[PDB]
Amino acid sequence: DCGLRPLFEKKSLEDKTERELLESYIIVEGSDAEIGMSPWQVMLFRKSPQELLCGASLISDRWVLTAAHCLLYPPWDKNFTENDLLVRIGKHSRTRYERNIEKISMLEKIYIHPRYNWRENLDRDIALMKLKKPVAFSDYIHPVCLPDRETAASLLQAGYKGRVTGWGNLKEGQPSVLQVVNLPIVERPVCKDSTRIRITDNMFCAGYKPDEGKRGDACEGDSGGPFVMKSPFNNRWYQMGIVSWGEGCDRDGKYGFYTHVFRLKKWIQKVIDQFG
Amino acid sequence: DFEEIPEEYLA
Numbered sequence: 430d431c432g433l434r435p436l437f438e439k440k441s442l443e444d445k446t447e448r449e450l451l452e453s454y455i456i457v458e459g460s461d462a463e464i465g466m467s468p469w470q471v472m473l474f475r476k477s478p479q480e481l482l483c484g485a486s487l488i489s490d491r492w493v494l495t496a497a498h499c500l501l502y503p504p505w506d507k508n509f510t511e512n513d514l515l516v517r518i519g520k521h522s523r524t525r526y527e528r529n530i531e532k533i534s535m536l537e538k539i540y541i542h543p544r545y546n547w548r549e550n551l552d553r554d555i556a557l558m559k560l561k562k563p564v565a566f567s568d569y570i571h572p573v574c575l576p577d578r579e580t581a582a583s584l585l586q587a588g589y590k591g592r593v594t595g596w597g598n599l600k601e602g603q604p605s606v607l608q609v610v611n612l613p614i615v616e617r618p619v620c621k622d623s624t625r626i627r628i629t630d631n632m633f634c635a636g637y638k639p640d641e642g643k644r645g646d647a648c649e650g651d652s653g654g655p656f657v658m659k660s661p662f663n664n665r666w667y668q669m670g671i672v673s674w675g676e677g678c679d680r681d682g683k684y685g686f687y688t689h690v691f692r693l694k695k696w697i698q699k700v701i702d703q704f705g
Numbered sequence: 706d707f708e709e710i711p712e713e714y715l716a
């Protein structure tokens with residue numbers, strides 16, 4: 430039942446911008462998300478001091494996916510352990526406690542990709558977090574699907590648009606509610622030529638070109654959040670990427686970079702079946 | 706400016 434939203438696909442209602450994504454299959458400068466628009470959205474919350482840590486996504490009733498750098502990044506003295514964080518699921522408002530809507534879960538264990546490259550370019554920027562207890566699904570809490578080879582091959586194409594969501598900074602201040610922006614996947618050569626950072630096959634970049642007019646990008650605080658696409662074949666939402674890195678936010682000629690979820694699915698599956 | 710969350714989750 431993954432990728433089918435209770436408030437949209439389940440009742441055959443479409444959100445305001447999913448049509449834009451469909452038409453392409455041939456957070457800075459975003460907008461407020463609709464209620465229940467991203468039911469798999471997860472907020473990584475630091476306990477003390479209480480603050481926004483990162484974004485993340487719900488992939489099952491006990492597993493949450495995020496960016497490895499959200500938990501481990503020596504250059505900025507970041508090395509969080511299970512008890513330093515909490516996961517808040519089903520949220521819309523950034524700062525308020527959404528009583529009777531959001532659910533807060535404690536972390537049982539964190540698993541960071543063994544070959545996550547924090548020293549150089551954040552290659553394989555992915556991590557899994559197992560919750561202590563399963564979270565109850567609801568109209569605002571629902572898992573997103575993970576792509577198989579076919580889905581990745583057909584949707585991960587230059588020009589095809591995905592959707593990024595998060596409570597991160599609005600500019601390179603803070604948003605009142607969850608932000609959303611649809612961005613087109615960019616050709617590999619263009620991504621490469623836009624930066625001096627070495628790009629790997631475990632990454633892809635997205636965003637509009639300077640001559641395209643439209644804008645939008647992820648920013649500080651959005652890390653770990655999902656880059657999703659709605660399959661035109663089975664109408665389910667798939668998480669194709671994880672907000673990973675960028676140079677500035679929404680700069681002309683620059684693009685946000687995302688962890689290529691399918692490329693690392695082997696690892697994801699290995700972790701899940703081995704550890705329950 | 707984060708609203709305080711119930712104690713059960715912080716314990």
Ligand SMILES: O=C1Cn2c(Cl)cnc(c2=O)N[C@@H](Cc2ccccc2)CNCCCNCCc2ccccc2CN1
Pocket residue numbers: 498502549550551626646647648649650651652672673674675676677678684685686
């Ligand atoms: O901050 C991060 C992750 N992140 C980390 Cl841990 C370190 N350095 C970042 C970066 O982006 N950007 C710097 C270039 C760089 C990329 C990869 C490894 C080392 C240096 C260059 N300077 C730091 C920029 C920090 N704000 C980046 C905001 C932004 C924009 C688009 C997508 C995700 C994000 C947030 N993600």
